Design a protein around this ligand. Structure first.
Ligand code: FAD
Length: 291
């Protein structure tokens, strides 16, 4: 049922870049690009929450061909134009200290020109799939590029064109995105996210943790864990619903604080969060993808 590995590293799909647009507005930190690829000519299909591999050109420091890097799909199964012909990624340029270094695949992607051919593999992953049940509740805890699978979910749920194309999925549950980025300009897809909340105030809640513009009660910069702590009781109450799914995505590091906050909330009703969570993971309702 779920498509997987229609293309593999030994014989990847050669797609063409259609467009490559900036998601970080002026005054933001770093570079994050929305890149859309043409899938026509092959049979690459995918669903929300999956990933694809991109094989960058060139060789590594040892002269070995570069290997694929995985990127979370940022478009629904239908693509951004709802035509079933494309796929999009949300790619941050990796750059860092000394160990000024630019990540190989991410720099290649963020600077890639439309018309360029790209080696694509996948799709892969069954850990971040959205439930078919339209009355499910969906909690989304994302930082930076972790917004990507969340975009696939929220677009499928809330875009007019998606609703028209998906007769079998008219979402009527409640979705809540807690999104941590350093600055307002760094809020990826800000305009569309807020548009979704204005149109579906009863079905979508949007919460930001903006570290350079907000302080937590302890006076430190505001991070996603802080927002989870702030709304821990509410989040725990939603999670107790048999139909609630929680999704965590972004660079590793946020899970510890999220657990600590949810643990304190659950403890109030005599529940051991770490145990409850184990059962949620077994049931396929606690979805994590960090990197
Ligand atoms: C399931 C999954 C989903 C992903 N989704 C996304 C996504 O949606 N968007 C996205 O941008 N990326 C995503 N990634 C990460 C992506 O796959 C690449 O790992 C990332 O883009 C960097 O790859 P690169 O080739 O550009 O860097 P590389 O040239 O491969 O360099 C990576 C290496 O740099 C070193 N390094 C990294 N950070 C530091 C640091 N700060 N200080 C010192 N050394 C460091 C480490 O050795 C690391 O192994 C995802 C990864 C996985 C596994």
């Amino acid at each position: 049922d779920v498509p997987v590995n229609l293309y593999r590293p030994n014989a990847p799909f050669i797609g063409k870049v259609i467009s490559n647009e900036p998601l970080v507005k002026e005054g933001g930190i770093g570079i994050v690009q929305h890149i859309k690829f043409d899938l026509t000519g092959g049979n690459l299909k995918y669903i929300e929450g999956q990933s694809i591999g991109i094989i960058p050109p060139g060789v590594d420091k040892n002269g070995k061909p570069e290997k694929l890097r995985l990127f979370s799909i940022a478009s629904t199964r239908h693509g951004d134009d709802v035509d079933d012909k494309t796929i999009s990624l949300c790619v941050r340029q990796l750059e860092y200290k000394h160990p000024t270094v630019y990540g190989v695949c991410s720099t290649y992607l963020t600077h890639i020109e439309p018309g360029s051919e790209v080696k694509i593999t996948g799709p892969v992953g069954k850990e971040m799939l959205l439930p078919d049940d339209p009355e499910a509740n969906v909690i989304m805890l994302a930082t930076g590029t972790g917004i990507a699978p969340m975009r696939t979910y929220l677009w499928r749920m809330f875009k007019d064109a998606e609703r028209a194309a998906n007769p079998e999925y008219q979402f009527k549950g409640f979705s809540w995105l807690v999104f941590g980025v350093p600055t307002t300009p760094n809020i990826l897809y800000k305009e569309e996210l807020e548009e979704i909340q204005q149109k579906y105030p009863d079905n979508f809640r949007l919460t930001y943790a903006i570290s350079r513009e907000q302080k937590n009660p302890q006076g430190g910069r505001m991070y996603i864990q802080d927002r989870v702590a702030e709304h821990a009781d509410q989040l725990w109450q939603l999670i107790k619903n048999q139909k609630t799914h929680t999704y965590i995505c972004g660079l590793r590091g946020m899970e510890e604080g999220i657990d600590a906050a949810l643990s304190a909330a659950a403890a109030k009703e005599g529940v051991t969060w770490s145990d409850y969570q184990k059962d949620l993971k077994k049931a396929g309702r606690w979805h994590v993808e960090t990197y």
